[PDB]
Amino acid sequence: SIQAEEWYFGKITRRESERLLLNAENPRGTFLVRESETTKGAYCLSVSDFDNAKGLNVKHYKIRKLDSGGFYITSRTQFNSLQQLVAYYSKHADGLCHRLTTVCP
Numbered sequence: 590s591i592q593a594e595e596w597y598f599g600k601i602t603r604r605e606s607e608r609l610l611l612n613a614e615n616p617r618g619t620f621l622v623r624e625s626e627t628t629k630g631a632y633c634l635s636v637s638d639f640d641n642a643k644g645l646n647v648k649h650y651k652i653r654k655l656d657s658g659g660f661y662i663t664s665r666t667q668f669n670s671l672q673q674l675v676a677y678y679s680k681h682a683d684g685l686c687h688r689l690t691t692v693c694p
């Protein structure tokens with residue numbers, strides 16, 4: 590049950606997610622999952638990143654959900670639950686800016 594997850598921030602805007610993530614104390618991969626502002630039934634994975642080029646910054650990835658049950662960022666890599674998706678991206682960076690490391694404070 591996604592709403593019970595401490596990383597699920599629910600109905601917060603993109604700007605608020607950036608306010609929370611743009612904190613000097615957050616290491617790369619600090620994240621949160623929220624609802625998409627404009628896509629009904631889709632969620633967003635907001636992730637903090639850091640490089641010497643851009644410094645501290647935030648990326649937003651859309652998580653699609655199938656009525657057939659799967660969750661995914663890219664259709665080639667699907668999961669049975671949002672929880673499994675988070676667990677997989679905590680170990681593989683794949684196309685994300687960084688692997689998921691710590692839940693946003």
Ligand SMILES: O=C(O)C(C(=O)O)c1ccccc1
Nearest residue numbers: 603625626627633649650651
């Ligand atoms: O869906 C949106 O409106 C939105 C957002 O809420 O920032 C978004 C846009 C691109 C990727 C993830 C999320």
